[PDB]
């Protein structure tokens, strides 16, 4: 519910997509996502999981810390959006949740793609647009996400 | 690996 020793579970289900090598696991991340909509109460240590697993974690696993990301994202606007869980406490809602990411979200997105091959690109790509019809504030889309940068250090053809 | 592994949100 808080500060207890359930976070154990949602710990231990991060850690369990760290183990695998495409890092993704739709069914475990909508285990975490689950017991995150069920308590907002601790979107604190939630969203310091996601943004400190995507941005340590390889490649694969920058990949599904973007899906549970879009799943945990989403969903927690969108009960919100639904709930009066928009008219509550910073911490313990989308508030301070959308807020928190809305600051970082350029560092996740930045190094996903210029980690990330270009069908990964592509996965994170519907996931932004997946973004613009929930309507997450967290548009941080500088050229930062876009990592041309990156993408000069890189061969490529198109011609 | 295991799981639903790749899982694919959408929206219309």
Redesign the interface.
């Known amino acids: 519910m808080q500060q207890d020793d359930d976070f154990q579970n949602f710990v231990a289900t991060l850690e369990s997509f760290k183990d ?3 890092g ?6 909508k285990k975490l996502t689950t017991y995150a909509l069920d308590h907002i109460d601790i979107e604190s240590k939630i969203i310091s999981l996601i943004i400190d697993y995507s941005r340590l974690c390889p490649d694969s696993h920058k990949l599904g810390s973007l ?1 549970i990301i ?2 945990i994202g ?1 969903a927690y606007l969108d009960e919100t959006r639904s709930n009066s869980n928009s008219s509550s406490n910073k911490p313990g809602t989308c508030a301070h949740a959308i807020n928190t990411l809305g600051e970082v979200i350029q560092e996740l997105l930045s190094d996903a793609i210029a980690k990330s091959n270009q069908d990964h690109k592509e996965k994170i790509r ?2 932004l ?2 973004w613009d ?2 309507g997450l504030f967290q548009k941080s889309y500088l050229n930062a996400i876009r990592s041309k940068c990156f993408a000069m250090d890189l061969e490529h053809h198109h011609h | ?7 694919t ?3 219309s």
Not at chain 1, 24 to 29: P, V
């Open positions: 695998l090598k495409s993704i696991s739709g069914s475990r991340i899906y879009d799943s989403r519907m996931l647009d997946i019809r929930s | 690996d295991d799981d639903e592994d790749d899982y949100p959408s929206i």
